[PDB]
Enzyme design. Structure first.
Site, PDB file in Angstrom:
ATOM      1  N   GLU A   1      -4.994  -5.706   1.345  1.00 21.99           N
ATOM      2  CA  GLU A   1      -6.388  -5.294   1.318  1.00 21.99           C
ATOM      3  C   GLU A   1      -7.214  -6.174   2.234  1.00 21.99           C
ATOM      4  O   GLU A   1      -6.932  -7.363   2.391  1.00 21.99           O
ATOM      5  CB  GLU A   1      -6.944  -5.333  -0.105  1.00 21.99           C
ATOM      6  CG  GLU A   1      -6.876  -6.693  -0.764  1.00 21.99           C
ATOM      7  CD  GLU A   1      -7.230  -6.638  -2.238  1.00 21.99           C
ATOM      8  OE1 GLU A   1      -8.432  -6.513  -2.555  1.00 21.99           O
ATOM      9  OE2 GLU A   1      -6.305  -6.705  -3.078  1.00 21.99           O
ATOM     10  N   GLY A   2      -8.224  -5.578   2.854  1.00 19.90           N
ATOM     11  CA  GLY A   2      -9.097  -6.295   3.768  1.00 19.90           C
ATOM     12  C   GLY A   2     -10.186  -5.362   4.269  1.00 19.90           C
ATOM     13  O   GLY A   2     -10.442  -4.319   3.670  1.00 19.90           O
ATOM     14  N   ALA A   3     -10.820  -5.740   5.374  1.00 20.89           N
ATOM     15  CA  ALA A   3     -11.892  -4.948   5.963  1.00 20.89           C
ATOM     16  C   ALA A   3     -11.437  -3.540   6.306  1.00 20.89           C
ATOM     17  O   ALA A   3     -12.254  -2.635   6.476  1.00 20.89           O
ATOM     18  CB  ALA A   3     -12.441  -5.644   7.203  1.00 20.89           C
ATOM     19  N   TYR A   4     -10.130  -3.362   6.432  1.00 18.02           N
ATOM     20  CA  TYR A   4      -9.566  -2.060   6.767  1.00 18.02           C
ATOM     21  C   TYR A   4      -9.478  -1.198   5.515  1.00 18.02           C
ATOM     22  O   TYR A   4      -9.230   0.003   5.588  1.00 18.02           O
ATOM     23  CB  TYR A   4      -8.173  -2.235   7.365  1.00 18.02           C
ATOM     24  CG  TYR A   4      -7.235  -3.044   6.494  1.00 18.02           C
ATOM     25  CD1 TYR A   4      -6.565  -2.456   5.427  1.00 18.02           C
ATOM     26  CD2 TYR A   4      -7.034  -4.389   6.727  1.00 18.02           C
ATOM     27  CE1 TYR A   4      -5.706  -3.189   4.632  1.00 18.02           C
ATOM     28  CE2 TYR A   4      -6.176  -5.133   5.937  1.00 18.02           C
ATOM     29  CZ  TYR A   4      -5.519  -4.527   4.888  1.00 18.02           C
ATOM     30  OH  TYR A   4      -4.668  -5.261   4.101  1.00 18.02           O
ATOM     31  N   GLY A   5      -9.682  -1.831   4.367  1.00 20.42           N
ATOM     32  CA  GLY A   5      -9.599  -1.146   3.091  1.00 20.42           C
ATOM     33  C   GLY A   5      -8.433  -1.728   2.315  1.00 20.42           C
ATOM     34  O   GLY A   5      -8.366  -2.937   2.092  1.00 20.42           O
ATOM     35  N   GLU A   6      -7.498  -0.869   1.931  1.00 21.48           N
ATOM     36  CA  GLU A   6      -6.333  -1.309   1.183  1.00 21.48           C
ATOM     37  C   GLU A   6      -5.132  -0.413   1.447  1.00 21.48           C
ATOM     38  O   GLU A   6      -5.282   0.768   1.763  1.00 21.48           O
ATOM     39  CB  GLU A   6      -6.645  -1.337  -0.313  1.00 21.48           C
ATOM     40  CG  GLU A   6      -5.436  -1.179  -1.205  1.00 21.48           C
ATOM     41  CD  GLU A   6      -5.807  -1.099  -2.674  1.00 21.48           C
ATOM     42  OE1 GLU A   6      -5.077  -1.682  -3.507  1.00 21.48           O
ATOM     43  OE2 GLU A   6      -6.835  -0.459  -2.995  1.00 21.48           O
ATOM     44  N   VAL A   7      -3.942  -0.987   1.324  1.00 23.08           N
ATOM     45  CA  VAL A   7      -2.704  -0.243   1.518  1.00 23.08           C
ATOM     46  C   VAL A   7      -1.942  -0.273   0.214  1.00 23.08           C
ATOM     47  O   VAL A   7      -1.727  -1.338  -0.361  1.00 23.08           O
ATOM     48  CB  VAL A   7      -1.844  -0.834   2.661  1.00 23.08           C
ATOM     49  CG1 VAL A   7      -0.499  -0.124   2.727  1.00 23.08           C
ATOM     50  CG2 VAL A   7      -2.575  -0.736   3.991  1.00 23.08           C
TER      51      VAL A   7
ATOM     52  N   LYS B   1      -2.835   4.231   3.116  1.00 24.16           N
ATOM     53  CA  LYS B   1      -3.955   3.411   3.539  1.00 24.16           C
ATOM     54  C   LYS B   1      -5.223   4.110   3.065  1.00 24.16           C
ATOM     55  O   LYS B   1      -5.483   5.255   3.435  1.00 24.16           O
ATOM     56  CB  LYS B   1      -3.966   3.273   5.068  1.00 24.16           C
ATOM     57  CG  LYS B   1      -5.113   2.427   5.625  1.00 24.16           C
ATOM     58  CD  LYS B   1      -5.228   2.588   7.138  1.00 24.16           C
ATOM     59  CE  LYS B   1      -6.151   1.532   7.744  1.00 24.16           C
ATOM     60  NZ  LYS B   1      -5.887   1.321   9.198  1.00 24.16           N
TER      61      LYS B   1
ATOM     62  N   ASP C   1      -3.615  -6.060  18.746  1.00 26.06           N
ATOM     63  CA  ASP C   1      -3.617  -7.041  17.654  1.00 26.06           C
ATOM     64  C   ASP C   1      -2.220  -7.329  17.163  1.00 26.06           C
ATOM     65  O   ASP C   1      -1.960  -7.344  15.957  1.00 26.06           O
ATOM     66  CB  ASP C   1      -4.522  -6.578  16.494  1.00 26.06           C
ATOM     67  CG  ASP C   1      -4.945  -7.737  15.556  1.00 26.06           C
ATOM     68  OD1 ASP C   1      -4.978  -8.911  15.994  1.00 26.06           O
ATOM     69  OD2 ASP C   1      -5.288  -7.439  14.389  1.00 26.06           O
TER      70      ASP C   1
HETATM   71  C1  LIG Z   1       7.769  -5.100   0.413  1.00 23.20           C
HETATM   72  O1  LIG Z   1       6.538  -5.776   0.634  1.00 23.20           O
HETATM   73  C2  LIG Z   1       5.638  -5.175   1.459  1.00 23.20           C
HETATM   74  C3  LIG Z   1       4.476  -5.946   1.689  1.00 23.20           C
HETATM   75  C4  LIG Z   1       3.430  -5.504   2.544  1.00 23.20           C
HETATM   76  C5  LIG Z   1       3.585  -4.253   3.128  1.00 23.20           C
HETATM   77  C6  LIG Z   1       4.739  -3.476   2.870  1.00 23.20           C
HETATM   78  C7  LIG Z   1       5.786  -3.917   2.053  1.00 23.20           C
HETATM   79  C8  LIG Z   1       4.592  -2.200   3.591  1.00 23.20           C
HETATM   80  O2  LIG Z   1       5.443  -1.316   3.588  1.00 23.20           O
HETATM   81  N1  LIG Z   1       3.361  -2.250   4.251  1.00 23.20           N
HETATM   82  C9  LIG Z   1       2.900  -1.251   5.099  1.00 23.20           C
HETATM   83  N2  LIG Z   1       1.761  -1.364   5.765  1.00 23.20           N
HETATM   84  C10 LIG Z   1       1.595  -0.246   6.596  1.00 23.20           C
HETATM   85  C11 LIG Z   1       0.401  -0.096   7.431  1.00 23.20           C
HETATM   86  O3  LIG Z   1       0.248   0.841   8.198  1.00 23.20           O
HETATM   87  N3  LIG Z   1      -0.463  -1.122   7.217  1.00 23.20           N
HETATM   88  C12 LIG Z   1      -1.735  -1.315   7.747  1.00 23.20           C
HETATM   89  C13 LIG Z   1      -2.499  -0.288   8.272  1.00 23.20           C
HETATM   90  N4  LIG Z   1      -3.763  -0.438   8.695  1.00 23.20           N
HETATM   91  C14 LIG Z   1      -4.297  -1.673   8.577  1.00 23.20           C
HETATM   92  C15 LIG Z   1      -3.631  -2.765   8.043  1.00 23.20           C
HETATM   93  C16 LIG Z   1      -2.318  -2.580   7.592  1.00 23.20           C
HETATM   94  N5  LIG Z   1      -1.549  -3.603   7.074  1.00 23.20           N
HETATM   95  C17 LIG Z   1      -2.236  -4.693   6.397  1.00 23.20           C
HETATM   96  C18 LIG Z   1      -1.183  -5.607   5.775  1.00 23.20           C
HETATM   97  N6  LIG Z   1      -0.283  -6.201   6.780  1.00 23.20           N
HETATM   98  C19 LIG Z   1       0.430  -5.097   7.464  1.00 23.20           C
HETATM   99  C20 LIG Z   1      -0.504  -4.064   8.073  1.00 23.20           C
HETATM  100  C21 LIG Z   1       2.595   0.693   6.512  1.00 23.20           C
HETATM  101  S1  LIG Z   1       3.787   0.161   5.405  1.00 23.20           S
HETATM  102  C22 LIG Z   1       2.659  -3.493   4.027  1.00 23.20           C
END
Ligand SMILES: COc1ccc2c(c1)C(=O)N(c1nc(C(=O)Nc3cnccc3N3CCNCC3)cs1)C2
Length: 263
Positions: free
Chosen positions: A14-20, A35, A121
């Site tokens: 989670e952050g300024a982008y919202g949350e995943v 997301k 980035d």
């Molecule tokens: C198993 O542990 C984890 C821990 C963190 C994450 C995952 C698995 C996982 O599949 N994540 C995924 N993130 C995305 C994605 O598009 N994220 C993403 C998209 N837009 C902004 C920020 C993002 N994330 C923030 C957190 N760091 C990664 C980028 C697609 S899958 C993040």
């Protein structure tokens, strides 16, 4: 709670982008990443960019859904987590592992640049790993078109993360997109091999950066890096973007092509 047929089970960030969130289909048990963004285009551009991506080293985009002020982007889930977590502080990781991740990162970047897209980035927090530890580039919220109809457009906007940004981004009114992403990849490689970032930012006000320009490699983090990969870093982390090594030439580098095996 849930979106359509998907249940949101765990926060992946989670952050300024919202949350995943990790979304699990109650019926199929399939897992994807969702997301969630509060409307509170920006997301429109990100969506349009994601729709054009199809590569094994880029987080896949399955589609999106809008529900009021909330937008939901369905993305590829990466069970391996973030590359950031594979970097032991002050240590890095085994050179063979770093080389493999670097080859995969190069593949993803070549793909993006090939379609005229720059990420802007690149950093370990945005590089994810699948179940087989294959690297996937994520977060296209800062991405932009730098080539269209075979015409390149210089960039001017300030975006990225200081420790990873190229020096020209701080000194030039306009600059080429590709060498900026190449520079970021070099910082990532440094972090992977040394478990630490070389400087807070690539400025003169930065002693660490000045030290590197003067070639004080007897200092950390360089002293922790083998001569072969260090030789590559010497070609990537070049201040003048015009003198900086290009991807085609990175692929011809001695270390890049060195057979490595753990252990
Ligand atoms: C198993 O542990 C984890 C821990 C963190 C994450 C995952 C698995 C996982 O599949 N994540 C995924 N993130 C995305 C994605 O598009 N994220 C993403 C998209 N837009 C902004 C920020 C993002 N994330 C923030 C957190 N760091 C990664 C980028 C697609 S899958 C993040």
């Amino acid at each position: 709670p849930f979106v359509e047929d998907w249940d949101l089970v765990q926060t992946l960030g989670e952050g300024a982008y919202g949350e995943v969130q990790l979304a699990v289909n109650r019926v199929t048990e399939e897992a994807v990443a969702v997301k969630i963004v509060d409307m509170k285009e920006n997301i429109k551009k990100e969506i349009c960019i994601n729709k054009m991506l199809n590569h094994e080293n880029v987080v896949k985009f399955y589609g999106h859904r809008r529900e009021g002020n909330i937008q939901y982007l369905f993305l590829e889930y990466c069970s391996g987590g973030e590359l950031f977590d594979r970097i032991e502080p002050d240590i890095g990781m085994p050179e063979p592992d770093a080389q493999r991740f670097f080859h995969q990162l190069m593949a993803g970047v070549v793909y993006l640049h090939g379609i005229g897209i720059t990420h802007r980035d690149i950093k370990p927090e945005n590089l994810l790993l699948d179940e087989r530890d294959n690297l996937k580039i994520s977060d296209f919220g800062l991405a932009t078109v730098f080539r269209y109809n075979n015409r390149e457009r210089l960039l001017n906007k300030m975006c990225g993360t200081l420790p990873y940004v190229a020096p020209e981004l701080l000194k030039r009114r306009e600059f080429h997109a590709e060498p900026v992403d190449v520079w970021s990849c070099g910082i990532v490689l440094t972090a992977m091999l040394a478990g630490e970032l070389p400087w807070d930012q690539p400025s003169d006000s930065c002693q660490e950066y000045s030290d590197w320009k003067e070639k004080k490699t007897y200092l950390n983090p360089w002293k922790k890096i083998d001569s072969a990969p260090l030789a590559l870093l010497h070609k990537i982390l070049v201040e003048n973007p015009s003198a900086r090594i290009t991807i085609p030439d990175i692929k011809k580098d001695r270390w890049y092509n060195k057979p490595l095996k753990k252990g």
